[model samples]
Target chain A: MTKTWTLKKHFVGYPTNSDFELKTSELPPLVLLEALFLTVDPYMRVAAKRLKEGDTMMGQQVAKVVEVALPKGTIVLASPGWTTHSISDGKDLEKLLTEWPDTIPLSLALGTVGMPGLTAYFGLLEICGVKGGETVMVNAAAGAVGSVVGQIAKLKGCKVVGAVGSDEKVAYLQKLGFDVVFNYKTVESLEETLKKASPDGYDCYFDNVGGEFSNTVIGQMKKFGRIAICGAISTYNRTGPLPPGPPPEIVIYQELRMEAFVVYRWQGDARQKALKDLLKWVLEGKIQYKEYIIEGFENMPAAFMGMLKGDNLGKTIVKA
Target chain B: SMTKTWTLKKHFVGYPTNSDFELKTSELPPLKNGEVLLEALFLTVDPYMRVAAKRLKEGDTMMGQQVAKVVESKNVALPKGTIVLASPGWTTHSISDGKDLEKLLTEWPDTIPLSLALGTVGMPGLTAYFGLLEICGVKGGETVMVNAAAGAVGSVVGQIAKLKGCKVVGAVGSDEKVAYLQKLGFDVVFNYKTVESLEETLKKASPDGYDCYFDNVGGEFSNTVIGQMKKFGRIAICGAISTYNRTGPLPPGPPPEIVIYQELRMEAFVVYRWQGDARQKALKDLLKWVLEGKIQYKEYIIEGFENMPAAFMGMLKGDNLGKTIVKA
Candidate 1:
């Protein structure tokens, strides 16, 4: 029997347990692959809004080829959503890094070296065009994408500043060598904290949390600042209209450039190079990562909900 | 003899009026070494003056640019009768060290008006040149849209897009403005004020959607335009003239979700960013285009320096069809 979780209804504000339904089906199934790790990301929350009710919940998973003419034990990343097993014709299947170390967890492929990793690599290096001695700021700096953004900016000789909700997250980012870390929740003044952190203002900003935080940050950007609008998780759950952003006059006077992008916008040789560099960074102890793993396919919905609530420190994954 | 000048009598609360500007005359001091006395030939009033004036204190000289001739020069590098562009602000005459002055191109045709040094072939021209060509990166066969299409910058934006082989859509306030741009080879021209539904009209104008948007008027109009942009559209935020006169809280702009999903790039710029070789190159190209009849220009000439305040207020109220100039 193959286990599956499907959307029972579309989300309203925050996702509730009733929104998902668990089903079991007798399988005539993939070359056959069985799920070993499933990724529950923040993008899933907004990305799902575009889907209809009763559809299979969308996500990426690390599955092993259980019955294939090739290798039965070979692992590959697949987009089988929230399912225990699947069959693929090599399309939508990416084999794990050949140089992947045995000491590294197979789950890291869905986190540190996966889509989230590529988001950070390209968003910083290409979009922001970060240079040495430039001051870079990133919000949600302890999460999967933000953590990698900060580390990568630092590696480029940038003075990295990070904003997080909890002191634990601040401390974690500080340990990762972020030049400035502040608990945005505890701080009395978001404006003052940002100004104090970088009195000269940010040259590059990697935005993960949008809304008022983004509105406030724009007023502090230096002339010719570049902002990479990767995600707006803060406004994803809003049932009402999204909040107003800062006036365009600030952008005009500062000559600021802001752009939004998805990882799929890039592919081929550049993508493979980024993946190899990400793997090498982790292996060299240059990039540190943490995963919040929940055991069993049954807990998929709960894991996704918790990830949205910021319960996990970094990448949230489910093990089957 | 005294130099006649205009100064801001008070900071504008909403819209400026005749009373807010005071005309005064001050005796000139002896020109120091390396200084020249400039006599104004033509002065310009623009929408940016309204926004930039917020930084000025009360009683400061009303900030502006003027085309002048160095009638008396103590500096050998700048001889008498040499025409130059200077930002001495609402004055008939002033002394300059030549540091803040740009000499007119040597090959400037006698057929072209010197007033153009303050309009086309100057800052407004460069604003459109850089914002569209470099910032928006317009390509041939792309559909481009610009608002305030009869005004200095917007007119140039449309003409340049047409010159680059792009289908151009222009949005203006007056039917006369519409008639003018239509004659200028704009593919489509509409009076935005007369449209029943902006969204519907915009959709009808270009069903495939715009690849590039040169936004001179911001706020709600821009929010609507953002919805009609093709995926990966580039928007150059040149000015926000629509909201320049507001006294209360401004209207909310479009949400981040639209920009994120559309994957659009929106950037803003100032013309002053281009300097040295880049600035000279843009000015030269603009002059060549104008002389070649590929670009057309019009001037709303308001005679006399004493009418500086009236000209400025009129320009702010959109009284002029093109560049508003006070010919002294």
Candidate 2:
């Protein structure tokens, strides 16, 4: 027998686990497309709310093809969530799994080496246009995308600076080769700290956490700087109007260019090129990755909630 | 034999008349170090003089650039009996160091006439060269619209724009000047007096809108011309002859509003900034055009130095065809 956990209700304010308790549904006998491993990521926290209630929770996982008629043993990475098995046609399932051996660990595909990996790749190179020897300042520096962005900038010869909320995360970022890592919570003034940390002025700013932190960074940018705007997690949960008034006049005076992009924009040749380069970097030991795994499929919601609250150190993932 | 001379007696208000100036004769001074003494052969009267005279006090020799011949030279560089150009103003003879008077006495080529420097290769030439090329950045196939087409600067501006591959259009005060502009290779020319509206006339002449506008007459006419500029267009604010003789303080105009709406780039240039470069470029290009038989210039020379006031008034009334100079 096969069962699946699905969303039950929409969420408002802080969402409790009961507000999204998973339900199980039996599946009919079907051809096994593939069977593989998958993990739950924290980005799902917002994607979950964007969908209507009662819809299947959307995620990415690895799987394999087993039976031609009833492909049961297809060993595909599946994100069926909280349930044991998922059945699908082999065509869509083929896209879900990688051909790498089991020794390489499938959970890494869910965190650093998968969708989050691609996000970091294009975000740094394309949007930020990180020049060699320039400074790259990132917020939420020890998180999935932030951690990867710092490493990539290091590989390209940039001076990497990271801002994190906790001392341990600051240490983690330091261990990961961040030139200057700061615990933002205990810091008196973010502007003064950043100015001291990056005395040369930030050249390429990768914005993750928005609000006052971003405003301070913008104030510190040199003339003709570039800003790559990704996620604004600080402002995402706000129920009221996204702060009022015109953008500061200094934005025009400095002639800064800021752009927001979704990774889906680079789908064909561009996506493949980026993936190939990242894979080579990983093989040659030029790129380092980290993942914070939460054990048990039942703890998926807990893992997501913890990640959103900055509990997880790096890319947050759940083992099913 | 002694030559008669006029010393500027007093400055006048508005247009200068005969009584405002006086004629006198005096023996010339000897030349000094790096000095070349010259007798005035021809003295030019221009609209710019009116502005310059306001800065002068009574009994100061009236200022003008004149073509003259070197009667004597103490410096080895300037030999005696050399036909040169000098700006001694209303005086008959004056001495100059080589440094201060080089622009006044540009060497005339064998084929080109010396008078060409007074009109096409002189101050007006410098005005057109710097104003159009530097200020407007005139490119080939773009349209350049200029006012005061029959005047010295205007004629040279139209010709230079043509040489740079721009379509030249000019606005003048009479049909005769309009015909003159046409003969000078202006793609489109209009008589400003005959037209009921400047806006309508500019629209019909340059339907695609002017890419570079050379504004010489800054008033309601320029307001209309600037209204028709395309985006990223440039305006060279050269001369405002219309406002030069205003009876009272000039009223605020529409140029401010037009500047904002079009995001236009406009600059007022005095050719003195591009001095050496202007002379070299203007002399080379003007000499080439003169030699090729491409340029023909007209001059209205008043009989003697005594008629300077009459010539100044006549030029102000738009009596001259090309340039107005006094023969002494």
Candidate 3:
């Protein structure tokens, strides 16, 4: 018997356990082209709302291909989404497992060593154009993408400043070689705090939380600055129809370039290149990663709700 | 030959007129070190007169540039009987110390008509060249819109934009001028006078929106055109002939809002400041175009140098096509 956790309804606000009902489905007979993996993730809070109701909840996970009809047993990363199993043709599954072995804790194949890691890599390098000796400020400093961005900046010989919601996350970011880390809750004003911390002004601003925080950082950018607009977690759950206020006039006067990107844009060989480099950095100790594991597949909704409320640091993973 | 002369009658308030000028004859000054005396054969009356007249005194000759012959010379370099272009300004004869003689004469080429030294191949040519190519950075496949398309600067601007692979649209004051601009390879042309709304006409004609705008007539026309510009559009404020005569402050328009939304860049340009590089580039390119028959130039020559004021007034009133020049 196989289990599948299906979405029951669309979420309007902060989704509770009642918003989702898990039901089991029988495993379809394995075909020559079919294999499966169970997936559970913490970043699906807003993505779930965007999905059509009754669709299987989407996520990524590491799974063992126990009964492959062709290539035999293959350990692969996939997204069965709070389900006991999934199916693949063993073609892409073979590459994901065998092609990259240094990628340990296989869950990392789902988090930093995977999708979130690729997001930070390309977003910072391509959009922000992070250069040596320049200052880069990142929001959500202890979260998945934010932690990777800070560490990558440090590795590139840049001055990295981080902002998190808690002191423990701040300490962890500092341990990750962040030159400056601040618990934003203790700070009275983001603009004043950034001005005092980075008195020289930010050269590259990587915005993970858009809204008033982004507006303040944009005002403090130096001439010909670049901003990588990755996520807007601040306003993601809002029920309002209006967009936030526009950035100050200086944004145009100084000629800042802001770009948003999705990791899927660089799949195939480009994705492999990023994963290879990230794995090498982890082995060389040039990069550090943290994972917040919430046990039990049934607790997936609780983990997701908690992650959205900033309860997890680094990549938040739900174990099935 | 007639001994023609020009005089300054009075200073103009906005647009110049015959009453604002006077004509008189006086003995020509003797040539000095490295100097030459040129007799004016052809003189020019241009839109620049509107701006130049604002600085004129009660008894000074009207300001202009002309094509002339070097009747006498004190220097060995500039020989006698050499045809030269001069900025002697409405006078039949004038002396030039070679110190500033180059401004009065560009080496006349045999392949191009000498009158071009005053119109398409002269200041107006340089204005269109530098204002469009250098300032706006007009590229291939983009669209450029210009006002006063039948006039000197606008005509040259549309031609150059076309040569650069741009789709050229022109707005002229009359339907006849619109037809004339269409014959000059304009992708689209309209008469601003007959159109009920310039904004709607432009939007309908250029559905993709203007990528570059060469503004010759400023005021509400410019404001409406700017409202239809695409993102990162460039506006070269070459001449604002419409508002030059306004006795009071300019009327408020929607330029500020348009500028922000479209991220438009607007800059004012003066020919004098760009003369060094602009003049050389324009003369070379224009002469080549003229010789290749790729460009056509016309001069609305009003005979008699004494009638320079009348020519100047006629041009300001938009009575001429191409450049309005006076023949002495």
| Candidate with the greatest DockQ versus the true structure | 1
Identify the CAPRI category of the predicted complex in candidate 3. Answer: incorrect
Q: Can you write out model 2's per-residue Cα lDDT over A1-320, one digit (the tens) per residue?
A: 44344566665544567656666666677554332444555445556676767776677665554444334444554455445456665454334234454545665665556666677788789877876988888888887778878888999999988998899898887887889999988999998999999887888888777666777887777666677666666654545544321123334335455555555557777877776676667666666777676676667667766777788876766655
lDDT of 3 at B34: 83
Q: Relative to the true structure, how large is the alpha-carbon lDDT of every model? A: 0.89, 0.70, 0.73
Top TM-score model:
1
The candidates score, on chain A by TM-score, as follows: 0.97, 0.88, 0.91
lDDT of 3 by residue, A192-259 (tens): 89998899889998877776677788788886677776777766555543243333234433445555
Ten residues in sequence with the least summed lDDT for candidate 1 chain B: B248-257
The DockQ assigned to candidate 3 is: 0.03
Off by over 4 Å in 3: A31-50, A68-72, A80-82, A91-94, A97-103, B1-328
Those runs of model 1 whose alpha carbons end farther than 4 Å from true positions after fitting are: A26-30, A68-70, B76-80
Q: Tell me which of candidates 1 and 3 scores higher on DockQ.
A: 1
Cα miss at A34, model 3 (Å)? Answer: 12
Q: What are the TM-scores, per candidate, against the unseen true structure?
A: 0.96, 0.50, 0.56
lDDT of 1: 0.89
For residue B176, model 2's alpha carbon misses the true position, in angstroms, by 1.4
